[PDB]
Amino acid sequence: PSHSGAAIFEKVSGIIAINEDVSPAELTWRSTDGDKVHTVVLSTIDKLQATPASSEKMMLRLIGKVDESKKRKDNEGNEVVPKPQRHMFSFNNRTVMDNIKMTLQQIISRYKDAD
């Protein structure tokens, strides 16, 4: 129950695996049947969202760091304020999602401590 937890992506089912051996560490979701795969950079994970156990609502959200200070221009020639990254995953076992939320926290805090 570490660096891997059967997670649902885009309403689809699959396993979510995390690898801290790569820099920046990333998370890869692999369908159950192997029809869909997803990859996410954990190093950006600025906030971890998880549904409480008491809440029948099963879900897990990942928040990626931003950089509005960059100030990107739009097609209209006007500056815009970029938005922060946010992923949405669904789990069936509070334990599995509990591991992901716990493991992910270890990664953020890992980079947070450095800075």
Binding site: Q49, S55, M59
Partner: peptide, 14 residues
């Protein structure tokens, strides 16, 4: 329909 909708899932009700 909107992001706020999914956010409610975390708020739920006692």
């Amino acid at each position: 329909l909107s992001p706020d909708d999914i956010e409610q899932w975390f708020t739920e009700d006692p």
